[PDB]
Amino acid sequence: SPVHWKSAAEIVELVKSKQISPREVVESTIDLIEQRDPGLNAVVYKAYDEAREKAAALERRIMQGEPVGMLAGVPTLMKDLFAAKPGWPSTLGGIRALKDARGAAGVWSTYPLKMSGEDSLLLGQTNSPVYGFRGTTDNTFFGPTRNPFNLDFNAGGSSGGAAALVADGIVPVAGGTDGGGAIRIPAAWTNTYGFQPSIGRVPFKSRPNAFHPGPYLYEGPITRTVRDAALAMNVLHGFDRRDPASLRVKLDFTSALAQGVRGKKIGLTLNYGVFPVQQEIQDLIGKAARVFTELGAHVEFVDLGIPYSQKQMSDAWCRMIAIPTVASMQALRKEGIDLYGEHRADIPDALMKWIDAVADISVQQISADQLLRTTVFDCMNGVFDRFDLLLAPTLACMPVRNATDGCTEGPSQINGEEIDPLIGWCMTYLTNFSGHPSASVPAGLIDGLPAGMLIIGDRQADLDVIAASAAFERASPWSQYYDIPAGRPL
Ligand SMILES: CC(=O)Nc1ccc(O)cc1
Numbered sequence: 001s002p003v004h005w006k007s008a009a010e011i012v013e014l015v016k017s018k019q020i021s022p023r024e025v026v027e028s029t030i031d032l033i034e035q036r037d038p039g040l041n042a043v044v045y046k047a048y049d050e051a052r053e054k055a056a057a058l059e060r061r062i063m064q065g066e067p068v069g070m071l072a073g074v075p076t077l078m079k080d081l082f083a084a085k086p087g088w089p090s091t092l093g094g095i096r097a098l099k100d101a102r103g104a105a106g107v108w109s110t111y112p113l114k115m116s117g118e119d120s121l122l123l124g125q126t127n128s129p130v131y132g133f134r135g136t137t138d139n140t141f142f143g144p145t146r147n148p149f150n151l152d153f154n155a156g157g158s159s160g161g162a163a164a165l166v167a168d169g170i171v172p173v174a175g176g177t178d179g180g181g182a183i184r185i186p187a188a189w190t191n192t193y194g195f196q197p198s199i200g201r202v203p204f205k206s207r208p209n210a211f212h213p214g215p216y217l218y219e220g221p222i223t224r225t226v227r228d229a230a231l232a233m234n235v236l237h238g239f240d241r242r243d244p245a246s247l248r249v250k251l252d253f254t255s256a257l258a259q260g261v262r263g264k265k266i267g268l269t270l271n272y273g274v275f276p277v278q279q280e281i282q283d284l285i286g287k288a289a290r291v292f293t294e295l296g297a298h299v300e301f302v303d304l305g306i307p308y309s310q311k312q313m314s315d316a317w318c319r320m321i322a323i324p325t326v327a328s329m330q331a332l333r334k335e336g337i338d339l340y341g342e343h344r345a346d347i348p349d350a351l352m353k354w355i356d357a358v359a360d361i362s363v364q365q366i367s368a369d370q371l372l373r374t375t376v377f378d379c380m381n382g383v384f385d386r387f388d389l390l391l392a393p394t395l396a397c398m399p400v401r402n403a404t405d406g407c408t409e410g411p412s413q414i415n416g417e418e419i420d421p422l423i424g425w426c427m428t429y430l431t432n433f434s435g436h437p438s439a440s441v442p443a444g445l446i447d448g449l450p451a452g453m454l455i456i457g458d459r460q461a462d463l464d465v466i467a468a469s470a471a472f473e474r475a476s477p478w479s480q481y482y483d484i485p486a487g488r489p490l
Pocket residue numbers: 081082131132133134135157158177178179180181182183217321
């Protein structure tokens with residue numbers, strides 16, 4: 001294959017130097033998807049002819065010396081969760097009742113708009129759980145997205161299809177969305193790099209309600225290299241007056257790749273003082289943290305002092321996400337797609353529990369959750385009063401086995417403590433409360449399966465996160481572990 005395992009940086013140079021046509025990039029990527037995706041079950045929509053059309057036009061511009069974009073010829077896919085691209089489907093993570101829906105003219109999600117704007121080629125959409133409402137990827141319409149490191153296990157979620165394609169070498173970058181960790185969760189379970197930007201760094205369009213009570217929502221890349229993530233972030237970030245959090249700031253993310261971390265003060269936590277975390281993960285992260293000490297950074301353990309239990313916090317997150325989920329379900333029912341009645345089977349019971357719970361949620365309850373959120377925000381800020389960076393495990397547990405009922409979920413206990421199987425073990429959701437940028441960096445393998453370390457920066461310190469990530473990547477590479485999916489039976 002001319003493109004299998006090639007980086008985005010490599011493909012851009014192959015295309016711009018005219019070593020390979022955009023046409024061949026598309027046909028070769030299609031070959032890989034048809035050959036390798038049957039096992040992964042990561043792709044839920046194929047836009048092959050559209051990509052072929054775009055490649056023909058890109059090829060003409062290249063041969064004629066007309067202007068081309070920063071990501072010219074890079075193949076990618078977007079996530080099927082609140083997906084908006086004209087003419088494309090949007091099933092909200094495998095809701096069968098929505099299978100015939102198609103995007104209206106002029107309405108775009110950020111990832112497909114901006115990536116295609118710089119001449120990346122969109123080949124289709126990737127699998128997500130229903131309404132993104134769990135840290136695994138499975139649903140009863142498309143099924144589970146499986147882990148390239150072991151297909152008996154789940155890829156993670158909700159951006160599981162995105163991470164699976166990237167970890168299997170099929171595309172160098174894929175788009176994720178993140179409301180409780182969905183860029184970072186599947187990255188951790190698949191040995192890939194998931195970058196969740198500062199709130200307001202990448203435009204997020206929430207309509208009809210831009211002022212909803214949900215957590216911070218992000219769009220961001222999943223890649224195999226930090227450089228590819230920096231390139232994608234150069235495209236994705238930027239001012240958009242229609243996002244009420246948007247930052248009117250221009251950055252060069254590639255400028256941070258060679259910065260290093262010498263002299264940086266780094267805080268370390270193994271469980272944020274409140275989560276049950278599998279011991280093997282704690283040990284791996286303790287080792288990973290010491291990589292920064294060899295690089296000239298000063299690392300020490302920190303206590304965030306979070307006064308809430310992890311169950312209180314996951315319950316609050318579920319209610320926060322459920323309110324806009326309910327708004328969507330009510331809107332759909334008004335347009336003739338009734339997920340409460342006729343198509344109730346399309347909604348997982350675990351989700352409907354929260355849908356029912358917030359149907360007439362009181363202002364007192366809304367307020368209590370906002371107070372919790374504020375407390376977590378301030379606990380995070382307390383760290384960045386004194387430290388440059390915070391390190392933690394991305395997740396409290398290793399990948400789970402796929403179920404056969406379309407409802408793969410996480411564990412309901414870790415170390416004998418009860419934990420919410422949908423999101424409780426996804427410690428990532430703290431930054432959806434707080435707004436800080438963070439990235440999941442591959443920390444190694446435990447019994448042949450990947451585990452991630454989360455690097456968190458100060459508010460708007462995206463470049464610090466990139467700098468630390470690239471430094472770690474150099475000193476503690478993870479690319480060798482791709483030998484496992486590269487050699488898997490097809
Ligand atoms: C795990 C997670 O982030 N889920 C999720 C992602 C996007 C969204 O809009 C709602 C929920």
